[PDB]
Amino acid sequence: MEQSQHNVRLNLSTLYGSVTASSVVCQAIYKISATRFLICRDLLILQHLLLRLGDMALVGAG
Amino acid sequence: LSRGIPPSYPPPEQFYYPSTYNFDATCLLNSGLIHFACTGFQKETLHFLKKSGSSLNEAIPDGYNRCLAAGLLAPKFTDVQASSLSQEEQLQAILAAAVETSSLGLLTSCIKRWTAEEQPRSAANLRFVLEWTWKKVTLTKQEFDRLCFRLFDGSCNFIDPHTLQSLQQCHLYFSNLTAVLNCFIAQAKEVTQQGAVDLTNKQSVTRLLTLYASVVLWFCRSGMLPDSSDETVQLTRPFYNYQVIQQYYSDQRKKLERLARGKWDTSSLMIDGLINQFGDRIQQLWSRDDNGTGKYPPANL
Amino acid sequence: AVVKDSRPDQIAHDDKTKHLKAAFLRYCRKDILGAQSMVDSLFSDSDMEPDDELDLAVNQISVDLIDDYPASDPRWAESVPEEAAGFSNTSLILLHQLEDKMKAHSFFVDFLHQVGLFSRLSTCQTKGMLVATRLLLSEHAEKLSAAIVLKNHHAKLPVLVNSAIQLALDKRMCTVPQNLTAADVYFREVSQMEIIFECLVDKEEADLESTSIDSVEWANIVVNVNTILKDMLHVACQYRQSKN
């Protein structure tokens, strides 16, 4: 999505964008960035751990 | 209500005893709830010993006795009591078991604990465990060679899950002993320079075996043995056409020679220069293959 | 928390020795007050009476201190994980262990003087002959210095001294931990170092029977042993004279 304007269908297209909205959006993106950061790190750790475990209690690992 | 996980299926006889059943429960009253745990004695003893790991040796008798009584030890460790053993051999057996459990962390944490506070027999214990580690490396590499030779020759085309499990156990052992030696050099404040040199030599040996086990396991799991060009073992993965590729690069080499004549230095392949930096050691290594002696692609996997 | 009855040797003696060790560790940590408090907690220091039990406890504490490397010393440093083959300063570690042994003996003597127990030191029964325990501690220090200079000779003229060390070890049938060494064990229990002299002598006639004419070692060996033995006698004499 470049700065090519789309065809407006409501005035809700121009609605919202205030400084309060900016602050809320920045707080939310910070929070979700942190949460997804932790989640993805845990996912990679679990992936590597399960790959290294192999058949120690597992079956069908082929 | 649940049971523990084994380092290798099937579960031992300890799984079939109620002592393995660790379960928490809640009793309702007329004043509240009271919550308790059942058969946590084994982990209580284990964690007490580990927190006493800075002086673990003196508590090994009683702690090992408690673990045996709770059934935490493997079924084979129940036949020998801490009263008839000494703390050192008890610890060596525990360290061995941690190796087959693929638990290098227990050894690393225990040795780091021993590095602090006065404990004279810690040096003796680490010495004994290091020669034990090296001899275990030797036996594991010998056993791995015995498993892999029948596949290299081609006698066994498909191994069983048990052979695959044993190979995975050997690889995990290699990883754990790597970690043990690297920890050892990490908290080693003082060794002879010759000792450091040979310890680094043996750790490099462990790296070679670990990567070799990984790659050979990968070929076995992918079915690339005996060899990948074997059309009989290729039913799930791209097969290999040795003749086409080898003849193509032989023709490439001849074409390069004929173009170079005596006005160019370029008369060898890029892989040829690559092996040249390593010298003719690789030539002697590969001088047992058909379609050229030490010529890429070498015929032997 | 006193223990009833003195008697020659029982658990009360072990309790008294543990209390003496704790007071001595306080003195090493530089606390005269706690050491004196423990001393008063066992025996009044206002007494000038001869106390064979007190002297025996002091002597046993000294024996343990001189035959075992003291707490918190570099010998514990490689006892806790450092020893697989050893590092490059093992001889220095042994030397400084002897240094700390001398320092601890000095601290114990000063502790006894401070708490007034050195004055109460009267006698003990040794080999059928009575020795003042003050003299016993003096001899402990003298043979500790003898062990120090013996390690010096061990460094300077190694082959003969090590041959004598191993021969005396054979005659002594005492075990050696792998963390310790042969010289370390020999230098720890300084009570029996005398074996080394006659071991040297036996090796001396053994070699001199073989030695023939046109031999300079024929006299050099004797020169070396003469110097060494004179030196130990020298150091013992001077320590005794200085510390009387």
| DSSP state at residue C129 | E
CB contacts, 8 Å: C88 with chain B: 190, 192
For B283, list phi and psi in degrees, rounded to 5.
-60, -45
H helices of B21-160, in order, are 41-51, 56-70, 87-100, 104-114, 122-153
Look at residues B171, B190, B173 and name the one whose alpha carbon lies nearest to residue B133. Answer: B173
CB contacts, 8 Å: B117 with chain C: 80
CB-based contact, B197 to chain C, within 8 Å:
no
Q: Do B172 and A59 touch (CB under 8 A)?
A: no
DSSP line for B256-292: HHHHHTTT-S--S-HHHHHHHHHTTHHHHHHTT-SSS
For C205, the token pair is 């006639």
Q: Do C84 and B191 touch (CB under 8 A)?
A: yes
What is the H or E stretch that residue C130 is in? strand C129-131
Query: B99 CA to chain A: closest CA distance, Å?
Result: 13
Q: Tokens 């020298």 map to which residue? A: C234
From CA C155, how far away is CA B45, in angstroms rounded?
Answer: 49
Which resolution in angstroms does this entry have? 8.1
Query: A38 CA to chain B: closest CA distance, Å?
Result: 24
- Provide the residue type at B123 as one letter: A
Mutate to test the interface with C, among B190, B193, B194 (most CBs of C within 10 A): B190
Rg, chain A, Cα only? 22
CB-based contact, B8 to chain A, within 8 Å:
yes
For C133, the token pair is 């325990």
Q: Which residues pair with C130 in a beta bridge?
A: C125
Q: Do A56 and B172 touch (CB under 8 A)?
A: yes
Do B115 and B186 touch, CB atoms closer than 8 A? Answer: no
CA-nearest residue of chain B to A51? B168
From CA B37, how far away is CA B44, in angstroms rounded?
Answer: 11
Look at residues C27, C28, C56 and name the one whose alpha carbon lies nearest to residue C39. Answer: C27
Cα B212–chain centre separation = 11
From CA C176, how far away is CA C187, in angstroms rounded?
Answer: 12
From CA B230, how far away is CA B239, in angstroms rounded?
Answer: 8
Measured between CB atoms, which of B5, B168, B175 is closest to A55? B168
Q: Do A54 and B172 touch (CB under 8 A)?
A: yes
Do B294 and B287 touch, CB atoms closer than 8 A? Answer: yes
Measured between CB atoms, which of C84, C88, C177 is closest to B126? C84
Q: Given phi > 0 = left and psi -120 to 50 = alpha, else beta, which region is B192?
A: beta
Q: Do B9 and A62 touch (CB under 8 A)?
A: no
Give chains near C: 3+ CB pairs under 8 A.
B
Cα B74–chain centre separation = 20
From CA C163, how far away is CA C195, in angstroms rounded?
Answer: 12
Q: What is residue C26's three-state secondary structure?
A: helix
Look at residues B79, B175, B74 and name the one whose alpha carbon lies nearest to residue B133. Answer: B175
DSSP line for C104-117: HHHHHHHHHHHHTH
Q: Do B171 and A54 touch (CB under 8 A)?
A: yes
Long-range contacts of C43-50 (CB under 8 A, 24+ apart): C43/C117, C43/C120, C45/C115, C45/C116, C45/C117, C45/C120, C47/C120, C48/C119, C48/C120, C49/C120, C50/C120, C50/C122, C50/C123
Long-range contacts of B56-64 (CB under 8 A, 24+ apart): B56/B91, B56/B110, B56/B113, B56/B114, B57/B87, B57/B88, B57/B91, B57/B114, B57/B119, B57/B121, B57/B122, B57/B125, B58/B87, B60/B87, B60/B90, B60/B91, B61/B87, B61/B90, B64/B90, B64/B94
- Provide the residue type at B173 as one letter: Y
From CA B278, how far away is CA C107, in angstroms rounded?
Answer: 65
Q: Which residues pair with C125 in a beta bridge?
A: C130
Do C54 and C134 touch, CB atoms closer than 8 A? Answer: no
Look at residues B250, B226, B249, B252 and name the one whose alpha carbon lies nearest to residue B239. Answer: B226
CB contacts, 8 Å: B195 with chain C: 84-85
Q: Do B192 and C82 touch (CB under 8 A)?
A: no
Q: Do B6 and A57 touch (CB under 8 A)?
A: yes
From CA A21, how far away is CA A27, in angstroms rounded?
Answer: 10
CB-based contact, A60 to chain B, within 8 Å:
no
From CA B55, how far away is CA B119, in angstroms rounded?
Answer: 6
CB contacts, 8 Å: C86 with chain B: 190-192
From CA C96, how far away is CA C75, in angstroms rounded?
Answer: 9
CB-based contact, A56 to chain B, within 8 Å:
yes
Q: How was this structure determined?
A: cryo-EM
From CA B79, how far away is CA B155, in angstroms rounded?
Answer: 39
From CA B252, how far away is CA B250, in angstroms rounded?
Answer: 5
CB-based contact, B91 to chain C, within 8 Å:
no
Query: B123 CA to chain C: closest CA distance, Å?
Result: 5
Look at residues B143, B134, B152, B287 and name the one whose alpha carbon lies nearest to residue B215. Answer: B152
| B87-96: burial string, b at 16+ Cβ within 10 Å, e else | beebbbbbbb
From CA C168, how far away is CA C189, in angstroms rounded?
Answer: 13
The half-sphere exposure of C105 on its side-chain side, counting CA atoms within 13 A, is: 28
Measure Cα distances from C147 to B55, B77, C120, C153, C160 in Å: 32, 47, 28, 10, 16
